[PDB]
Design a binder for these strands. Structure first.
Ligand SMILES: [Cl-]
Ligand SMILES: [Cl-]
Ligand SMILES: [Cl-]
Ligand SMILES: [K+]
Ligand SMILES: [Mg+2]
Ligand SMILES: [Mg+2]
Ligand SMILES: [Mg+2]
Ligand SMILES: [Mg+2]
Ligand SMILES: [Mg+2]
Ligand SMILES: [Mg+2]
Ligand SMILES: [Mg+2]
Ligand SMILES: [Mg+2]
Ligand SMILES: [Mg+2]
Ligand SMILES: [Mg+2]
Ligand SMILES: [Mg+2]
Ligand SMILES: [Mg+2]
Ligand SMILES: [Mg+2]
Ligand SMILES: [Mg+2]
Ligand SMILES: [Mg+2]
Ligand SMILES: [Mg+2]
Ligand SMILES: [Mg+2]
Ligand SMILES: [Mg+2]
Ligand code: NA
Ligand code: NA
Ligand code: NA
Ligand code: NA
Ligand code: NA
Ligand code: NA
Ligand code: NA
Ligand code: NA
Ligand code: NA
Ligand code: NA
Ligand code: NA
Ligand SMILES: [Sr+2]
Ligand SMILES: [Sr+2]
Ligand SMILES: [Sr+2]
Ligand SMILES: [Sr+2]
Ligand SMILES: [Sr+2]
Ligand SMILES: [Sr+2]
Ligand SMILES: [Sr+2]
Ligand SMILES: [Sr+2]
Ligand SMILES: [Sr+2]
Ligand SMILES: [Sr+2]
Lengths: 194, 237, 46, 119
RNA sequence: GCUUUACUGCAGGCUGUCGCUGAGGACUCUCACUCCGGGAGGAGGACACCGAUAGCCGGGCA
RNA sequence: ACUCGUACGGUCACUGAAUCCUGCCCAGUGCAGGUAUCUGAACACCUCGUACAAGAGGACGAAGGACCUGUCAACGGCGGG
RNA sequence: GCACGGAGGCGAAGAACCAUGGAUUUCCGAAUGAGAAUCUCUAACAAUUGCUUCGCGCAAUGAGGAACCCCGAGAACUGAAACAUCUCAGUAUCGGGAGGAACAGAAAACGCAAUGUGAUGUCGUUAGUAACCGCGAGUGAACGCGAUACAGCCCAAACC
């Protein structure tokens, strides 16, 4: 039969309809009053977190992060530029907001490593994402068959090197064939043209 | 070119800041619970560096010693009241609602409880004209009819120091001393007297603005100089 | 000026270094303090 | 609160929890929102409880309407930990379901009846 | 380096539109949101602010 | 920042103590206000087109402009016959 | 010791010397009790975190490293015989971060279209080809093939 989870999932397909609509309207009022990174006891979208790797266990942390909405907050050129490099208003950054959120979360919890993240809405001036972070030093995790991989040295600060699911997608690594000529194995090795 | 003086201002560097560390106090109305059971005694009259007008030090019943924006005619010993039931006497503060139409007031609040925003300069006063259950109409010093929440508090009387403007400075040195008590860069070099790189009006053999002075409201900073969005100029017509 | 305890330790070290290469080092090496300094001609750090 | 559409009197909640406790000793009961959900879906449920202090609310938002289109009666409990204690758990429980009472069928019936009346 | 009704652009301002954003070609309301208030509460209000885009101005700047 | 400031204020400009004075010009340019009619973008809407889409046209029309007015201690002008 | 002196001493109680392991290891320094131009003042994981016995009790982070590597920010001189798209170039330089290598990686692939190939780097080639471009100057792949090395697995959910 359908899992209880499928119901949370199905609710979030139309965050603007039904009970979820009213919940969000209520919640955001409180979220707007909270900081940039608020640790939370439980995921807001359980089905999504469990799907991404979350477990109700010691060493697993969840945090909600908000970021200002919109394009780049770029400073206009003070020195000479050809028309082409004078733009300031329509230029957007290359990292999506979800990625900016994962990094702020990870900076708040220096000892934890980002596992994944998902969206929990936005209003007219900001976006919220919840981020799952793991304590690579806690034995409950070092002994987990599904999460111990994140304890390896080379997984340190993984989010800052684009090793996140959101990181990999933003780097154009989704497709395995056409269109990924300059994204795989890395943007850098391809001269930064992807 | 280079940023004009008006643009250096916004950065709030020392040259443009007011000598705040020398200013005395924020003459905002006292905050009363209700009832008007607040009275104090004028304990002293002082000079206010920030406004070139006198201020009065009041000692309130509950033990609070605060400087007050004093109207004309207030002296040591006099008792002042602040509250809804305060007596309609010069120097007392109360909401416009409690004030009789046709009475000059000063230090009028813009929004109830803000402490006062209008008519605070030397010898000026607002004039309460109309009352109502929803709107108190006041005539401000500029002569404009302002609609205010009748819950906006004011002080009865005109501000102390009237006529300060009647006497000329006579000397640059006198202007100087006053300017040193304000957030202003003085003296003033004319735009026409500067190099083209420094102002829209600079440059040219003889001095003259090589352009009309009435500038559009939409003009960007650095260009908005001269007569800003003038509806008209001159004395004629 | 006024010297701190540390400054004084550093100044003292500079004074000590400012000495001759012992005569015996000459013989032993069979034939110059390249760091000889003068208070006037030179300038120390700080 | 968004999924709650009527308040239950402390007394009623009292009787319900007790009925639930004797249900696990005698009959059969499901502990957990997931198990509770499948029971309501498989139709093997007589009475389902739903805590009211559940945060986030999405975990249980579906129980009410799901129960209606399945005839299954349901009742609210002010606290999550009581439901878990009553359900015989050393932890809390956002929802519970009596999968066939046990020498409590009589009580369960009345509670359901009382609830319907309570709208 | 400087100028301007030189060429081409870029900030910035004004203006419409979409999102924020709700209920009953002009209108009422309150619940988001804004402001005042120590607080209760008051003022305002789906506007404004902010994100996006479109038209006009634009030697302020390249 | 101005600002512990509130029009007897402070911002932006011009002229440059006192004294006697400061004429004519609003066509151009600038600013500002108004504006029946005209013109005036995008989204939404309508027609054609496409099993859809590109696209073509339409209706509506904000600021702006056309047009009218105000203004020279506003840029400036006050000739030849 | 360099270091070719003088004096004196150590070494058969096997010194010197070399290898491995251990001891000692002032102060400043990430610098961490507070402060300071390497010192001072009155018990210290400062600060941010995780677990928590809710007590700094147990732990993590911080800074360094020649370049290499990953993720972000991103010029201009220059070329086009001027110059704006283009070029120089995702170069210089900047912010963040890991390792001994990084990154990638077990198909919602390929599309020598097939009765065919079968994770991913990389090397040779495909090729200055296709594609881009004031269609100017210039920019510029991929599939495949030959090699190198080869390796495939784990969750979420259903049912418990
Ligand atoms: Cl991380
Ligand atoms: Cl003055
Ligand atoms: Cl093939
Ligand atoms: K160039
Ligand atoms: Mg398993
Ligand atoms: Mg004050
Ligand atoms: Mg000064
Ligand atoms: Mg002057
Ligand atoms: Mg000059
Ligand atoms: Mg200029
Ligand atoms: Mg002149
Ligand atoms: Mg000596
Ligand atoms: Mg405020
Ligand atoms: Mg120029
Ligand atoms: Mg002059
Ligand atoms: Mg002069
Ligand atoms: Mg220290
Ligand atoms: Mg050239
Ligand atoms: Mg590589
Ligand atoms: Mg050419
Ligand atoms: Mg290229
Ligand atoms: Mg290919
Ligand atoms: Na971290
Ligand atoms: Na010296
Ligand atoms: Na020059
Ligand atoms: Na004219
Ligand atoms: Na050592
Ligand atoms: Na530590
Ligand atoms: Na502790
Ligand atoms: Na050339
Ligand atoms: Na040239
Ligand atoms: Na080109
Ligand atoms: Na072949
Ligand atoms: Sr680190
Ligand atoms: Sr004030
Ligand atoms: Sr105040
Ligand atoms: Sr000039
Ligand atoms: Sr005149
Ligand atoms: Sr000297
Ligand atoms: Sr619990
Ligand atoms: Sr004169
Ligand atoms: Sr005119
Ligand atoms: Sr293989």
């Amino acid at each position: 039969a359908r899992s209880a989870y499928s119901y949370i999932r199905d609710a979030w397909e139309n965050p603007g309809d039904g009970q979820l609509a009213e919940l969000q309207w209520q919640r955001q009022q409180e979220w707007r009053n909270e900081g940039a990174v608020e640790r939370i006891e439980r995921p807001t979208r359980l089905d999504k977190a469990r799907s991404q790797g979350y477990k109700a266990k010691q060493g697993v942390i969840v945090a909600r992060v908000s970021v200002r909405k919109g394009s780049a907050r770029k400073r206009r050129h003070k020195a000479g530029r050809r028309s082409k490099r004078q733009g300031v208003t329509r230029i957007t950054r290359r990292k999506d907001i979800q990625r900016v959120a994962e990094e702020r979360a990870s900076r708040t919890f220096p000892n934890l490593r980002v596992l994944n993240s998902y969206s929990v809405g936005q209003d007219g001036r900001q976006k919220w994402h919840e981020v799952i972070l793991i304590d690579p030093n806690h034995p409950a995790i070092q002994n987990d068959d599904d999460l111990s991989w994140i304890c390896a040295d080379d997984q340190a600060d993984r989010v800052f090197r684009g090793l996140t699911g959101a990181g990999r997608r933003n780097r154009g690594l989704s497709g395995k064939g056409k269109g990924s000529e300059k994204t795989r194995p890395s943007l850098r090795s391809n001269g930064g043209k992807a | 070119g280079r940023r004009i003086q008006g643009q250096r201002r916004g950065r709030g560097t020392s040259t443009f800041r007011a000598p705040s560390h020398r200013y005395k106090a924020d003459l905002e109305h006292r905050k009363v619970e209700d009832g008007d059971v607040i009275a104090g005694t004028v304990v002293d009259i002082e000079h206010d560096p920030a406004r070139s007008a006198p201020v009065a030090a009041v000692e309130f019943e509950d033990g609070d010693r605060r400087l007050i924006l004093a109207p004309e005619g207030v002296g040591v010993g006099d008792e002042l009241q602040v509250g809804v039931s305060a007596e309609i006497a010069p120097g007392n503060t109360l909401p416009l609602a409690e004030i009789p139409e046709g009475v000059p007031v000063c230090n009028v609040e813009s929004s109830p409880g803000d402490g006062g925003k209008f008519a605070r300069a030397s010898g000026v006063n607002a004039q309460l004209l109309t009352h109502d259950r929803n709107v108190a109409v006041v005539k401000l010093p500029s002569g404009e009819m302002k609609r205010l929440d009748p819950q906006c508090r004011a002080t009865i009387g005109v501000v102390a120091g009237g006529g300060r403007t009647d006497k000329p400075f006579v000397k640059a040195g006198n202007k100087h001393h006053k300017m040193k008590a304000r957030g202003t860069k003085w003296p003033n070099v004319r735009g026409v007297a500067m190099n083209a790189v420094d102002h829209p009006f600079g440059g040219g053999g003889r001095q003259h603005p090589g352009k009309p002075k009435s500038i559009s409201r939409n003009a960007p900073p650095g260009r908005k100089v001269g007569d800003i969005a003038s509806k008209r100029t001159g004395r004629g017509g | 000026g006024k010297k701190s305890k540390a400054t004084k330790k550093r100044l003292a070290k500079l004074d000590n270094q400012n000495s001759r290469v012992p005569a015996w080092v000459m013989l032993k090496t069979d034939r110059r303090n390249h760091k000889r300094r003068h208070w006037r001609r030179n300038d120390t750090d700080e | 609160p968004v999924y709650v559409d009527f308040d239950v009197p402390a007394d009623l909640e009292d009787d319900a929890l007790e009925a639930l406790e004797v249900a696990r000793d005698t009959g059969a009961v499901k502990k957990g929102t997931n198990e509770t959900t499948k029971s309501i879906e498989r139709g093997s449920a007589e009475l389902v409880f739903v805590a009211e202090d559940v945060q986030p609310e999405e975990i249980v938002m579906h129980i009410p309407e799901l129960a209606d289109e399945k005839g299954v009666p349901f009742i609210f409990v002010e606290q999550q930990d009581d439901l878990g204690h009553a359900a015989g758990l050393e932890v809390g429980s956002a929802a519970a379901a009596v999968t066939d009472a046990g020498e409590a069928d009589a009580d369960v019936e009345d509670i359901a009846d009382k609830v319907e009346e309570l709208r």
